[PDB]
């Protein structure tokens, strides 16, 4: 086991599984609320 | 030997607070509409 350690990194673990969807939809909701507020 | 064992709480808890602003400024805007109409 000397050729390569191959230590896991951040990208090795799953990324943007389900939290990123929640952040994206909350960002969209906030943007829609801002547009509605600016409209009035 | 057969069995085996960041989040949204950082966003929603602020999101409603942001929504709280949407529930507070608008009426003040009307007061602002009155404010410029008061002088």
Swiss-Prot record, chain A:
Glycans are attached at residue 3. The chain crosses the membrane at residues 19-38. It comes from the Eukaryota. It is found in: Cell projection, Dendritic spine; Cell membrane; Synapse; Postsynaptic cell membrane. Changing residue 14 to Q: No effect on localization to the cell membrane. Changed glutamate-gated calcium ion channel activity characterized by decreased response amplitude and changed desensitization without effect on response rise time or deactivation time course. Component of N-methyl-D-aspartate (NMDA) receptors (NMDARs) that function as heterotetrameric, ligand-gated cation channels with high calcium permeability and voltage-dependent block by Mg(2+). NMDARs participate in synaptic plasticity for learning and memory formation by contributing to the slow phase of excitatory postsynaptic current, long-term synaptic potentiation, and learning. Belongs to the glutamate-gated ion channel (TC 1.A.10.1) family. NR2A/GRIN2A subfamily. Contains an N-terminal domain, a ligand-binding domain and a transmembrane domain. Agonist binding to the extracellular ligand-binding domains triggers channel gating. Heterotetramer. Forms heterotetrameric channels composed of two GluN1/zeta subunits (GRIN1), and two identical GluN2/epsilon subunits (GRIN2A, GRIN2B, GRIN2C or GRIN2D) or GluN3 subunits (GRIN3A or GRIN3B) (in vitro). Can also form heterotetrameric channels that contain at least two GluN1 subunits and at least two different GluN2 subunits (or a combination of one GluN2 and one GluN3 subunits) (in vitro). In vivo, the subunit composition may depend on the expression levels of the different subunits. Found in a complex with GRIN1, GRIN3A and PPP2CB. Found in a complex with GRIN1 and GRIN3B. It is linked to Epilepsy, focal, with speech disorder and with or without impaired intellectual development: An autosomal dominant, highly variable neurologic disorder. Features range from severe early-onset seizures associated with delayed psychomotor development, persistent speech difficulties, and intellectual disability to a more benign entity characterized by childhood onset of mild or asymptomatic seizures associated with transient speech difficulties followed by remission of seizures in adolescence and normal psychomotor development. This is Glutamate receptor ionotropic, NMDA 2A. The chain holds residues 539 to 578 of 1464 of the full protein.
Swiss-Prot record, chain B:
Heterotetramer; the NMDAR subunits are modular and harbor tiered domains that function in concert to regulate opening and closing of the cation-selective ion channel pore. Forms heterotetrameric channels composed of two GluN1/zeta subunits (GRIN1), and two identical GluN2/epsilon subunits (GRIN2A, GRIN2B, GRIN2C or GRIN2D) or GluN3 subunits (GRIN3A or GRIN3B) (in vitro). Can also form heterotetrameric channels that contain at least two GluN1 subunits and at least two different GluN2 subunits (or a combination of one GluN2 and one GluN3 subunits) (in vitro). Changing residue 13 to R: In NDHMSD; loss of glutamate-gated calcium ion channel activity. Component of N-methyl-D-aspartate (NMDA) receptors (NMDARs) that function as heterotetrameric, ligand-gated cation channels with high calcium permeability and voltage-dependent block by Mg(2+). NMDARs participate in synaptic plasticity for learning and memory formation by contributing to the long-term potentiation (LTP). Channel activation requires binding of the neurotransmitter L-glutamate to the GluN2 subunit, glycine or D-serine binding to the GluN1 subunit, plus membrane depolarization to eliminate channel inhibition by Mg(2+). It comes from Homo sapiens. It is found in: Cell membrane; Postsynaptic cell membrane; Postsynaptic density membrane; Synaptic cell membrane. This is Glutamate receptor ionotropic, NMDA 1. A hydrophobic region that gives rise to the prediction of a transmembrane span does not cross the membrane, but is part of a discontinuously helical region that dips into the membrane and is probably part of the pore and of the selectivity filter. Belongs to the glutamate-gated ion channel (TC 1.A.10.1) family. NR1/GRIN1 subfamily. NMDA is probably regulated by C-terminal phosphorylation of an isoform of GRIN1 by PKC. Its phosphorylated state is influenced by the formation of the NMDAR-PPP2CB complex and the NMDAR channel activity. The chain crosses the membrane at residues 10-33. It comes from the Eukaryota. The lineage of its organism: Eukaryota, Metazoa, Chordata, Craniata, Vertebrata. It is linked to Neurodevelopmental disorder with or without hyperkinetic movements and seizures, autosomal dominant: An autosomal dominant neurodevelopmental disorder characterized by severe intellectual disability and developmental delay, absent speech, muscular hypotonia, dyskinesia, and hyperkinetic movements. Cortical blindness, cerebral atrophy, and seizures are present in some patients.
């Amino acid at each position: 086991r000397s050729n390569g350690t191959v230590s896991p990194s951040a990208f090795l673990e799953p990324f943007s599984a389900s939290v990123w969807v929640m952040m994206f939809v909350m960002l969209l909701i906030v943007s829609a609320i801002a547009v509605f507020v600016f409209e009035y | 030997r057969y069995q085996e064992c960041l989040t949204f709480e950082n966003m929603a808890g602020v999101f409603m607070l942001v929504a709280g602003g949407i529930v507070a400024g608008i009426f003040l805007i009307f007061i602002e509409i009155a404010y410029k109409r008061h002088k």
